[PDB]
Design a protein around this ligand. Structure first.
Ligand SMILES: [Ca+2]
Ligand SMILES: [Ca+2]
Ligand SMILES: [Ca+2]
Ligand SMILES: [Ca+2]
Ligand SMILES: [Ca+2]
Length: 318
């Protein structure tokens, strides 16, 4: 059921494509249109081969060439599109941790919505690319229970999905009830362990049972019990447990919504998910926000940036 919007090009000719790209940048000016139309029509793996051919044919670096030709957000998008899939998330994480400050929004968004299998891969790529340990970096840049919850998640050791044990579902729902609503203060340690290590199928049942017992959806309790980064993280985990696509569709909505656009987030979610579940994200989006992702992007963005974006997204109605 998980569908992306970008797939492998049928009659792919890495060499032919490279020539088209050279021609589009050679001499005075840039044919941004041909670049944009070609790249959003190739899978990430094909973009990498195109980059290889371009280098053996011209002895020039494609990405470095595009960076000198392209400008602004269009450049940022195309550059993101050229990053190998297995390196992109690591790349975004590294840059969220970089600088004096730390972009918790990015850490929270990626660590909460990625599966353990994905976190495992992201950690390997991170280390072999930046020569640093992802966990060490996160710990060094975060504090309190927010940091603890991230580290628990980074262990990529969530319980596997097996037959649901009802007594166990009851036990956990009551535990969460006593750890929050019935407690003076909050036992965050309890929330972290349960929310961070139980299997996804188990927690979905726990969320429902928790509603029955308390009359509150777990999200309401989280909002009532916590605040700050921890709150954001816990809501992200809960939301992702329920549906990653729905969670990401929501992240997108709020990136555009307001005034102006959180282009970094808009670019990050579309590119990182283009070959995973961007189609599903499209569906959850229309259902929940009554708008088509396409129409939303088409109204908040402009220029080639907007054209490339819509081509990667697609489906005006879906
Ligand atoms: Ca030129
Ligand atoms: Ca530039
Ligand atoms: Ca309380
Ligand atoms: Ca709150
Ligand atoms: Ca806006």
């Amino acid at each position: 059921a998980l569908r992306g919007t970008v797939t492998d090009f049928s009659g792919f000719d890495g060499r032919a494509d490279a020539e088209v790209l050279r021609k589009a940048m050679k001499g005075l000016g840039t044919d941004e249109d041909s670049i944009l139309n070609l790249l959003t029509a190739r899978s990430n793996a094909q973009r990498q081969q195109i980059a290889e051919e371009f280098k053996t044919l011209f002895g020039r670096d494609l990405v470095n060439d595009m960076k000198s030709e392209l400008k602004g957000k269009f450049e940022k998008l195309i550059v993101a599109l050229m990053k190998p899939s297995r390196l992109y998330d690591a790349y975004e994480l590294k840059h969220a941790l970089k600088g004096a400050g730390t972009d918790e929004k990015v850490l929270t968004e990626i660590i909460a919505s990625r599966t353990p299998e994905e976190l495992r891969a992201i950690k390997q790529a991170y280390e072999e690319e930046y020569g640093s340990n992802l966990e060490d970096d996160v710990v060094g840049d975060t504090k309190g229970y927010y940091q603890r919850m991230l580290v628990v998640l980074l262990q990529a050791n969530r319980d596997p999905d097996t037959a649901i044990d009802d007594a166990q579902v009851e036990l956990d729902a009551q535990a969460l009830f006593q750890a929050g609503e019935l407690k003076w203060g909050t036992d965050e340690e309890k929330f972290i362990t349960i929310l961070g290590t139980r299997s996804v199928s188990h927690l979905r049942r726990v969320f429902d049972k928790y509603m029955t017992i308390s009359g509150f959806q777990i999200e309401e309790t989280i909002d009532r019990e916590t605040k700050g980064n921890l709150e954001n993280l816990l809501l992200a985990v809960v939301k992702s447990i329920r549906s990653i696509p729905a969670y990401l569709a929501e992240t997108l909505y709020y990136a555009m919504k307001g005034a102006g656009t959180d282009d970094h987030t808009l670019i990050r979610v579309i590119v990182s998910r283009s070959e995973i579940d961007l189609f599903n994200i499209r569906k959850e989006f229309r259902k929940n926000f009554a708008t088509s992702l396409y129409s939303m992007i088409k109204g908040d963005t402009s220029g080639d940036y907007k054209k490339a974006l819509l081509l990667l997204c697609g489906g005006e109605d879906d």
